[PDB]
Design a protein around this ligand. Structure first.
Ligand SMILES: *[C@@H]1O[C@H](CO)[C@@H](O)[C@H](O)[C@H]1NC(C)=O
Lengths: 85, 352, 254, 85, 51
């Protein structure tokens, strides 16, 4: 059926965080990995870009060991960039 | 057994008082006749009303018929409620439960809201004032909150250029539909201001909220081109009303002022029906073998603690139990004294 | 040596206390005011009329009191006609009324200015009866001009018996309309009830914004909603950092 | 700089609805026009598609004269579909 | 976490602190093993900070 970019965004951030709480103290190193899990689960418009790119970048540029919660909470309101290119 | 009732007529109530006198003559049983004590006063003034009410009370009146403003109304309701003195009146309905008060005027809320739904108005403008109270405003606001209406409330009673402004933004936002909730005078004013700047053009729909829609002059917007809708309390095609006008239009302007007209203001008609209601009420009082005659002197209304006559309660009940057919239509009241079982005509202004 | 009127609504206690404190504090050797207090139901126009005339006939030089949205016209009219001065903390009049001194400052401008400050294009507005719909009429007009989307909801016609259920209901509809920003316009009591119901259904968490339209804001108990995470803004007429107020509290709290 | 598909969506639906209130009673005929107004105001990922396509279709397929409020209220939660193609 | 040694005087602040650290741990799921009274305290403190 029809897929919504917004719903896909929410799903993206949520699934990323849910993945990152599986890994602790190394979170900053696994952020990209968890992003690909969210991308592959919640689906993407462009396989390369992923479900929300801006979120992934914001996280990679923020997340510190055991800093997860606040990092995610500050990164989920960021703009997705663009799902196409 | 005779009967004495006090009246209160605001300065400028000429036609109303005329219909009062006409109702006095028309509804008359030989066993008893009402004894009007008339008082002309400025109704917007609370002090004047207090003083007039106490003046009637101390005179040992069985019931009072009068009017009230948004100011004096609480004085009337409180003083009546405290001294157990019945009060009849054409004035706007009260928001709440007020004992010893009989409101001749039907509640317009239901008719209005149902009309809004009828025309299917999802979004519109509402021009109100502070004269007859904000009860209707609260109603349309609540119903708007429930039904997800976009209503625009603008008080027009506190204010020419501003009108042009509001209608300008309305023109840009494309809100044609407007509801005028105002005094007859204010309505006339607003309409005049509408015609002057040409907001009466096609595409506009106005709803005049009052029972007076045909009682006033509709001739100005008749050629305007905009749809107009209103409310009518008195059907002039009814035989009762037909014969009433028949006798009314033939009256001498010398004796009864403003009588020679073909139509009559709804307030005035309500005055007439009020006379009817008091007559039938006291008729039911003397017919049920309950003597109403005042036990002791009323005394000083201010005298503490209050001194209500208990038997007067009966009179209240006697009024509320009245069911008659007047100009306004079927007349019956509930325990609180508000009109029930009323029918309100929905009018529309067309080319013809 | 001067006799002044004392009208106090039934249930006015801290007010009368501060009245007596002001009586002791401001009474000079030159003359002392001699208050004749009358406790009554202020909502009753008849009672107020009768009490006012009772003060008048005793030959009072000036009267201090309160009024309801009902009794106010009786007071303004009687003062204006009998030329008796009337002082009062009660809400301002929507017109110009002589022989009345309104101790309360006008809040309309402040409120509208705060709404403009936070930049609220859409919000909810909870009014009732008591303080008048004047503030509501104002915010509605200004909303019409500034394109605010106001949702007017009367909380005053809601009985103490059924209140909880309806509060949860209306706030449910509010959650559904997605309105986070809310303005509470009411007395401290109504405010406390509404806030309690907000915390109960957990609307006091982050993302929610509340504005108290009362002039005290510190006068009620907000400590319960303080840790919720939702923003709360209010207005304060009495600054507790002022030396006058500080020393006043010093003598008052003891 | 940052463009979010979600914020673009909310802005989209809102601007469409806000537009349709100028044309009241004629709304069913103006849905597409107002949609282009929203697309051009809030911007789009693809000029052709618009800000929210699925919303436009749902509305154009539902809105009736003076039916606006309920129509919009039922169509704004719909999936935007794919913003790219 | 043992909540039974929590002083009655300092309890409020200690609770706010503890739940803060829990928030950092990102723990939504919680098990209260306590007497009825202690449970009531914990719940009250949960509602106050809106958890
Ligand atoms: C009379 O009014 C009551 C009150 O609503 C209503 O139950 C009844 O149906 C009314 N009768 C008619 C004929 O409308």
């Amino acid at each position: 059926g029809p897929a919504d970019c917004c719903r896909m965004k929410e799903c993206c951030t949520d699934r990323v965080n849910e993945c990152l709480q599986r890994y602790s103290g190394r979170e900053d190193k696994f952020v990209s990995f968890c992003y690909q899990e969210a991308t592959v689960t919640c689906g993407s418009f462009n396989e390369i870009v992923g479900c929300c790119y801006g979120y992934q970048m914001c996280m990679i540029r923020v997340v510190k060991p055991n800093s997860l919660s606040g990092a995610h909470e500050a990164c989920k309101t960021v703009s997705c960039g663009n799902p196409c290119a | 057994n005779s009967i004495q009732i006090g009246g209160l007529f605001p300065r400028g109530a000429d036609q109303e008082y005329s219909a009062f006198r006409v109702g006095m003559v028309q509804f008359s049983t030989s066993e008893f006749r009402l004894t009007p004590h008339i008082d002309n006063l400025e109704v917007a003034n609370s002090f004047a009303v207090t003083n007039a009410f106490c003046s009637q009370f101390s005179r040992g009146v069985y019931a009072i018929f009068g009017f009230y403003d948004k100011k004096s109304v609480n004085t009337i309701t409180s003083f009546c409620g405290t001294l157990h003195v019945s009060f009849i009146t054409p004035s706007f309905p009260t928001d709440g439960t007020h004992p010893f008060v009989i409101q001749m005027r039907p509640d317009l809320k239901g008719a209005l809201l149902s009309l809004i739904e009828y025309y299917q108005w999802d979004k519109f403008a509402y021009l109100y004032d502070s004269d007859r109270g904000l009860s209707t405003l609260q109603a349309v606001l609540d119903s708007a909150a429930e039904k997800k209406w976009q209503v625009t409330a603008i008080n027009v009673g506190n204010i020419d250029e501003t009108y042009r402004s509001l209608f300008q933004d309305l023109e840009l936002k494309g809100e044609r539909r407007v509801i005028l909730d105002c005094e007859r005078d204010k309505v006339n004013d607003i309409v005049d201001q509408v015609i002057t700047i040409g907001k009466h053009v096609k595409g506009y729909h106005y709803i005049i909220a009052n029972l007076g829609f045909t009682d006033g002059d509709l001739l100005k917007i008749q050629f305007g081109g905009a749809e107009v809708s209103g409310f009518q309390i008195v059907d002039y095609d009814d035989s009762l009303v037909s014969k009433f006008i028949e006798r009314w239009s033939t009256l001498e302007e010398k004796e009864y002022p403003g009588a020679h007209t073909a139509t009559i203001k709804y307030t005035s008609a309500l005055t007439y029906d009020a006379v009817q209601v008091m007559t039938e009420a006291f008729r039911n009082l003397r017919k049920q073998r309950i003597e109403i005659s005042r036990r002791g002197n009323a005394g000083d209304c201010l005298a503490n603690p209050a001194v209500p006559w208990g038997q007067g309660v009966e009179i209240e009940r006697a009024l509320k139990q009245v069911q008659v057919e007047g100009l306004s239509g079927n007349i019956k009241f509930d325990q609180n004294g508000k009109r029930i079982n009323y029918t309100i005509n929905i009018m529309e202004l067309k080319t013809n | 040596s001067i006799q002044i009127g004392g009208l106090f609504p039934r249930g006015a206690d801290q007010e009368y206390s501060a009245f007596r404190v002001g009586m002791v504090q401001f009474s000079t050797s030159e003359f002392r005011l001699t208050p004749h207090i009358d406790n009554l139901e202020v909502a009753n126009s008849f009672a107020v009329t009768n009490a006012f005339c009772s003060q008048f006939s005793r030959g009072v030089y000036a009267i201090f009191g309160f009024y309801d949205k009902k009794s106010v016209n009786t007071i303004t009219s009687f003062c204006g006609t009998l030329h008796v001065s009337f002082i009062t903390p009660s809400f301002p009049t929507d017109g110009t009324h002589p022989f009345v001194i309104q101790m309360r400052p006008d809040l309309k401008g402040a409120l509208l200015s705060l709404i403009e400050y936070y930049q609220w294009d859409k919000f909810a507005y909870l009014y009732d009866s008591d303080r008048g719909l004047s503030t509501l009429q104002a915010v509605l007009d200004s909303a019409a001009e500034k394109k605010w989307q106001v949702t007017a909801i009367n909380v005053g016609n809601i009985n103490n018996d059924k209140k909880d259920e309806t509060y949860r209901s209306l706030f449910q509809d509010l959650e559904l309309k997605g309105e986070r920003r809310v303005i509470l316009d009411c007395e401290r009591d109504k405010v406390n009830d509404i806030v309690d119901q907000v915390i109960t259904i957990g609307k006091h968490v982050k993302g929610y914004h509340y504005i108290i339209a009362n002039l005290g804001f510190t006068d009620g108990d907000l400590l319960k909603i303080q840790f919720g995470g939702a923003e709360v803004s209010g207005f304060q007429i009495v600054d507790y950092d002022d030396s006058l107020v500080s020393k006043f509290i010093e003598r008052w709290s003891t």
